[PDB]
Structure formats: structure tokens, C-alpha cells
Amino acid sequence: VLSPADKTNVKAAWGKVGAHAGEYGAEALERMFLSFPTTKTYFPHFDLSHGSAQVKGHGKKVADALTNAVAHVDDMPNALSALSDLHAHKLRVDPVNFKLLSHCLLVTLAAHLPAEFTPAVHASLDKFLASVSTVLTSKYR
Amino acid sequence: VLSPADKTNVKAAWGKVGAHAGEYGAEALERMFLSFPTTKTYFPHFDLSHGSAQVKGHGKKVADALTNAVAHVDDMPNALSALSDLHAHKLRVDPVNFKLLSHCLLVTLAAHLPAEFTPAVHASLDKFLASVSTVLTSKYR
Amino acid sequence: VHLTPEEKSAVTALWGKVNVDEVGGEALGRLLVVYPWTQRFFESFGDLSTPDAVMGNPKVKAHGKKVLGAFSDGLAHLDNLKGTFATLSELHCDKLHVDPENFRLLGNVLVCVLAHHFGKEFTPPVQAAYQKVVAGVANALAHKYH
Amino acid sequence: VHLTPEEKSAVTALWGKVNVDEVGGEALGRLLVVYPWTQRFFESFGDLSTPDAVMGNPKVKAHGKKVLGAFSDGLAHLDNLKGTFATLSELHCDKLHVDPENFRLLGNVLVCVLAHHFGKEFTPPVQAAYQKVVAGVANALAHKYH
Numbered sequence: 001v002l003s004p005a006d007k008t009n010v011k012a013a014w015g016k017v018g019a020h021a022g023e024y025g026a027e028a029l030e031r032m033f034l035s036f037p038t039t040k041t042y043f044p045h046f047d048l049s050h051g052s053a054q055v056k057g058h059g060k061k062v063a064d065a066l067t068n069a070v071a072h073v074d075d076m077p078n079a080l081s082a083l084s085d086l087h088a089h090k091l092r093v094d095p096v097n098f099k100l101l102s103h104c105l106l107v108t109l110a111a112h113l114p115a116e117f118t119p120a121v122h123a124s125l126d127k128f129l130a131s132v133s134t135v136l137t138s139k140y141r
Numbered sequence: 142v143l144s145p146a147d148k149t150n151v152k153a154a155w156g157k158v159g160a161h162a163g164e165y166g167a168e169a170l171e172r173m174f175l176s177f178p179t180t181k182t183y184f185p186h187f188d189l190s191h192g193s194a195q196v197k198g199h200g201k202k203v204a205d206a207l208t209n210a211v212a213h214v215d216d217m218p219n220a221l222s223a224l225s226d227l228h229a230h231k232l233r234v235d236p237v238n239f240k241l242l243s244h245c246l247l248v249t250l251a252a253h254l255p256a257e258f259t260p261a262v263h264a265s266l267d268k269f270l271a272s273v274s275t276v277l278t279s280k281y282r
Numbered sequence: 283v284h285l286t287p288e289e290k291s292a293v294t295a296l297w298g299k300v301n302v303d304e305v306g307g308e309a310l311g312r313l314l315v316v317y318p319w320t321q322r323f324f325e326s327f328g329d330l331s332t333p334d335a336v337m338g339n340p341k342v343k344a345h346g347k348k349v350l351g352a353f354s355d356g357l358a359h360l361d362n363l364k365g366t367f368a369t370l371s372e373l374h375c376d377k378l379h380v381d382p383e384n385f386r387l388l389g390n391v392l393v394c395v396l397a398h399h400f401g402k403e404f405t406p407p408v409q410a411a412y413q414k415v416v417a418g419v420a421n422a423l424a425h426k427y428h
Numbered sequence: 429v430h431l432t433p434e435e436k437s438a439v440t441a442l443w444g445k446v447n448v449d450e451v452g453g454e455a456l457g458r459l460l461v462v463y464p465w466t467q468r469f470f471e472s473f474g475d476l477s478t479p480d481a482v483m484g485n486p487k488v489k490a491h492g493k494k495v496l497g498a499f500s501d502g503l504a505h506l507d508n509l510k511g512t513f514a515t516l517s518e519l520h521c522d523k524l525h526v527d528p529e530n531f532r533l534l535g536n537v538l539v540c541v542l543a544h545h546f547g548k549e550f551t552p553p554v555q556a557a558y559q560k561v562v563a564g565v566a567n568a569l570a571h572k573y574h
């Protein structure tokens with residue numbers, strides 16, 4: 001559960017991300033596939049090579065989904081309902097994998113925005129990604 | 142996130158507890174303290190012996206809190222805010238302990254309500270307790 | 283896993299009353315229903331679309347028999363769970379890449395199924411002894427991760 | 429933990445730039461801020477009431493230095509982490525009863541701190557090597573649980 005201050009921290013931080021959202025999403029995916037090779041089993045037909053245009057395209061989708069979630073932080077289940085059905089119903093993603101991607105997103109943000117990645121913002125972002133993860137791993141139709 | 146079916150299942154199943162609230166809550170606590178002795182560390186001055194009146198009294202509070210959660214299942218963070226501040230802010234209970242108590246609550250319900258504890262209701266109760274646990278382990282003021 | 287002789291006796295006596303043909307399937311079935319992502323490991327098992335379909339699925343019942351058999355094998359040699367489960371650990375960890383939290387989940391689902399079947403006989407001390415067993419089995423299954 | 433020669437070289441190169449007086453405290457402090465239940469284990473450390481209080485707490489900084497030292501030692505003993513960390517495992521598991529998921533959290537907070545400090549140098553292959561290291565350390569600390 002996010003505090004009011006958490007929501008403000010997340011909106012401010014993700015705002016600073018801005019037009020780099022796509023690049024960062026791709027980098028987080030690459031970090032995940034390399035650091036946690038078991039996660040690749042969910043993308044068996046993907047070109048997962050470094051610089052993959054397919055991974056770059058998917059990173060932009062992941063980032064745009066997060067931007068949507070930030071915009072609907074008070075109403076995430078309704079906003080993310082289609083994505084939840086995809087990940088929890090169709091793909092049946094083990095919840096551990098969301099912890100792994102969430103971590104790689106934090107690492108990516110830390111590497112690119114060190115001034116912004118204060119301990120308070122780090123805390124709020126971790127909670128936000130945990131909340132997103134809970135929605136995407138839940139079947140609630 | 143709970144589905145409409147989850148909420149229906151939980152309301153029906155938990156509704157059968159009734160005047161056995163104290164008994165079932167106490168049994169779940171006793172199961173936890175015995176099976177997972179590390180959890181006793183949070184109750185340093187309690188009488189945790191078998192049949193303890195103090196555990197019986199605490200079981201009633203836990204069960205009544207779950208009744209409260211059911212009656213506010215669509216708006217739980219606001220309904221449980223006092224309990225969140227107790228468990229997350231004051232007591233700093235490690236989240237793993239909520240998985241342990243939740244499991245012991247399921248065991249207790251399975252042992253007492255054989256007709257109710259179908260696979261579907263089991264699933265809904267597990268999600269419900271996980272949701273309650275997330276609220277009680279979050280700081281969101 | 284070290285059980286007291288009293289705990290081993292309690293565990294052994296209860297297990298003697300466990301239906302070899304059904305309880306494994308009930309536990310595996312409930313794993314698939316309660317933690318749906320686990321269904322991803324059982325694509326070839328056919329219809330898992332609803333709770334009733336899962337619990338009635340012939341392949342779930344048959345596979346559950348093997349799972350119970352492995353718990354049974356664990357019970358027979360509590361002082362050598364790692365040796366007993368070595369091949370199974372290779373399979374679940376190195377081949378299938380099952381996240382080990384799921385081993386804990388299945389053990390706890392089994393405990394729920396025992397409580398469901400035996401009611402008041404599944405006392406807190408009997409449970410505590412079974413929790414030692416299922417933790418030992420999960421740890422042995424996860425040995426290749428350690 | 430086995431590292432390729434390329435991974436070993438990259439891990440060592442990055443670690444040589446680590447400020448040993450500060451990074452441990454930053455990692456421990458962020459653990460306490462991001463995962464606040466971990467503060468229960470450090471009740472004697474004084475003011476932990478705000479992120480600023482945590483990060484500026486002298487006892488957090490001093491203790492972080494010891495934690496970083498353990499990671500540094502681990503880097504020199506990657507083939508014998510269970511041996512090297514045996515005393516620490518007994519302390520954290522048998523005496524303190526720290527749930528082992530918290531070991532994983534601290535390792536990943538450390539990775540975040542390295543990313544913060546070194547930016548473009550903390551490439552995805554460098555991260556992957558460090559994830560092997562912190563997983564090995566968490567596993568060795570948790571050995572008494574296995």
C-alpha cells in the first residue's frame with residue numbers, strides 16, 4: 001500500500017524519466033535476461049541479443065505501461081486489467097520474476113538518475129513496483 | 142487483488158466462524174507458535190502455553206479484525222489503518238510471519254469447516270489473507 | 283530433519299491413514315488452483331481451466347500419486363532427504379527451473395489437505411511435526427540451488 | 429560461485445573504486461529505509477525515524493563498514509563461501525533468526541548502491557557478475573537454514 005508521499009515521489013521520479021522511458025525499459029529487460037537467465041524462458045522466440053530491436057520495442061511497451069500505472073496510481077487494478085489478464089491468466093508468470101524485473105528497473109534508474117535516486121525515492125519506487133507486480137500477478141475478473 | 146468471486150467466497154466461508162471466532166483465532170496462533178517458534182519473539186511477555194487464556198483473548202482480537210476486514214474488503218487500507226500502524230510502524234513485524242499465520246489460519250479453517258474448504262474457497266481465502274497481510278505490513282499514512 | 287521419536291511416531295501413524303491414490307492429487311490439484319502460475323509447468327496435462335477441471339483431471343491425479351510417493355520416500359528416510367531427493371532436485375532445479383518458493387507452497391498445501399481430511403486429529407503438535415517434514419523435503423528438493 | 433575470467437576482472441575493477449568507509453553504510457541504511465521491518469534488528473542503534481536520520485546515523489555507518497568487509501572477504505573466497513561465512517551464518521540464523529529473504533534484499537540494495545555510484549560503468553554484464561556474488565553470499569549466510 002502506497003502512502004500519499006509515496007505517490008508524489010513516484011510521480012516526480014517517473015516524470016524525470018520522461019522521454020527516456022523506452023530506453024530504460026529496454027535496459028531493465030536486458031539486465032534481467034543477463035542477470036537472471038531463467039527469465040528468458042518467458043521469451044522463447046525473442047531475439048534477446050544485445051541491441052535487439054525486439055527487446056527495445058518491448059522495453060518501450062513496459063515503460064509505457066508503467067507511465068499508465070503512475071497516471072492511475074489510485075486505481076491501478078482498473079487501469080491495468082488487460083495487462084493483469086495477460087500476465088496472470090495467459091502467461092502465468094511466476095511472481096518471483098516480477099521481483100527480478102522490479103530490481104532491474106531500480107538498478108537502471110539508479111544508474112541513469114543518481115541525483116534523483118535518494119533513499120526516500122528508492123523506497124517509494126520499490127513499493128510502487130511491488131504494487132504493480134501484485135496487480136499483474138492477480139486474477140481479479 | 143480480489144475477484145468478485147473471491148469476495149463472495151470469503152464472505153460466505155468466514156461468515157461460518159461466528160461465535161467460534163476466539164476459538165479459531167486462538168487455535169491458529171497456537172499452531173503458529175508451535176510450528177514456527179521464531180514467531181514467539183514478538184510476544185515476549187505473553188503466556189503462550191497450551192490453553193492460555195491470554196492466547197484465547199488474543200485469538201478473539203485477530204478473528205474480529207478479520208471480520209472487520211471482510212466488512213470493508215473493497216477499502217481495507219482505510220479500515221485497517223490502526224492495525225497497520227501497530228504491526229508495521231510500531232512492532233516492525235517481518236512480512237514472512239504473516240505468511241506463517243495465514244497458513245495456520247487456513248489449516249484451522251480446513252480442520253473445522255470441511256464442507257466449506259473447497260479448492261476454490263481455499264484459493265480465495267489465501268488471496269484474502271495475503272491482501273490483509275500486505276495492508277498490515279505497509280506504512281501508508 | 284530430526285524428529286523426536288514421539289514426533290516420528292505421530293507423523294508415521296497419520297501417514298498410514300493417508301489415501302495413496304487420492305491425497306497427492308488433491309494436494310497437486312490445490313497447488314494448481316490456489317497458485318495458478320504453477321499451471322505453466324503442466325501444459326501437457328490437458329484441461330486446467332477451472333477448479334473442477336483441475337481436481338478431476340486424470341493426469342493431475344496420476345502425477346499427484348508420484349508426488350505423494352516422494353513424500354512417502356522422505357518419511358522412510360528422514361536422515362537422508364538430500365540423498366533421497368537428489369535426482370528430483372536435479373530435475374526440478376536444473377531442468378525445470380521451478381522457483382524454490384513453490385516447493386514450500388506445495389508442502390503447505392499438503393498440510394492443509396491433511397488438516398482437511400483428519401479434522402481434530404490434526405492437532406497443533408501433529409502439524410508442527412509435519413511442518414518439519416515438509417520443510418525438510420522442500421530444502422532437499424532445492425538442494426541444487428544451494 | 430564461479431566467475432568467468434572476464435567477470436572476475438570486471439568485478440575486481442569496480443570494487444577497487446568502492447569507498448569502503450561509506451558504501452556499506454549506504455547499503456545498510458537504504459535497507460532500513462526501503463524495508464522498514466529490518467529496523468527491528470537494530471533497536472540499539474538510536475534514531476532511525478527518518479531517511480535522513482538513518483543515513484546519517486553513526487552506528488549505521490560503522491556497522492555498514494563491517495558488512496562491506498564481509499562482502500570484500502567473500503570476493504576473495506568465492507569457491508568457499510559456505511566455509512568463510514559459517515560463523516556469520518550461525519550468528520544471523522541461529523542467534524538472530526533473521527529471515528533469509530532479508531539477505532537477498534541487502535545484496536540487491538548493495539547492487540543498487542553500486543549502480544548509483546558508478547552509472548555507465550555498472551553495465552548489464554557487470555551487474556550479472558555481481559548478482560552471482562551477492563546470491564552466493566546470501567546463500568552462504570542462509571546455510572544454517574538449509
Ligand code: HEM
Nearest residue numbers: 039042043061062065066086087091093097098101132136
Ligand atoms: C513491471 C512489471 C511488468 C510490466 C509493466 C509489463 C508490461 C508488459 C506489456 C506492456 C506487455 C505488452 C502486452 C501487449 O502489448 O500485448 C507485456 C508482455 C509480456 N510480458 Fe510483461 N510486464 C511486466 C513484468 C513481466 C515479467 C516479470 C515477465 C516474465 C519474466 C513478463 C513476461 C511477459 C511476456 C512473455 C510478454 C509477451 C511477450 C510476447 O509478445 O511474446 N512480464 N508486458
Ligand code: HEM
Nearest residue numbers: 180183184202203206207224228232234238239242273274
Ligand atoms: C491476519 C494477520 C493479523 C491480524 C488480523 C492481526 C490482528 C491483530 C490485532 C487485532 C491485534 C490487537 C490490536 C490492539 O490491541 O489494538 C494485534 C496485536 C499484535 N499482533 Fe497481530 N495480527 C496479524 C498478524 C500478526 C503477526 C504475523 C504477528 C507476529 C508474528 C503479529 C504480532 C502482533 C503483536 C506482537 C501484537 C501485540 C501484542 C501485545 O503486546 O499486546 N500479528 N494483531
Ligand code: HEM
Nearest residue numbers: 320323324348349352353374380384385386388389420423
Ligand atoms: C515440493 C515437493 C515436490 C515433490 C515431492 C515433487 C515430486 C515430483 C516427482 C516424484 C516427479 C516425477 C519425477 C519423475 O517422473 O521422474 C515430479 C515431476 C515434476 N514436477 Fe514435482 N515435486 C514437488 C514440487 C513441484 C512443484 C512446486 C512444481 C511446479 C510448480 C513441480 C513441477 C514438476 C513437473 C513439471 C514435473 C514433470 C511433469 C511431467 O512429467 O511432465 N514440482 N515431481
Ligand code: HEM
Nearest residue numbers: 466469470494495498499520526530531532534535566569
Ligand atoms: C546479506 C548480507 C549480510 C552480511 C554480509 C552481514 C554481515 C554482518 C557482519 C560482518 C556482522 C558483524 C558480526 C560480528 O560483529 O561478529 C553482522 C552483524 C549483524 N547483522 Fe548482518 N549481514 C548481512 C545481512 C543481515 C541482515 C539482512 C540483517 C537484518 C536485520 C542483519 C542483522 C544483523 C545484526 C542485528 C547484527 C548484529 C548487530 C549488533 O552488533 O547489534 N544482517 N552482520
